[PDB]
């Protein structure tokens, strides 16, 4: 996943 400028997981 993209959450605003990070991401985590896929």
């Given at each position: 996943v993209a959450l605003x400028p990070?991401?985590?997981x896929p």
């Amino acid at each position: 996943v993209a959450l605003x400028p990070v991401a985590l997981x896929p």
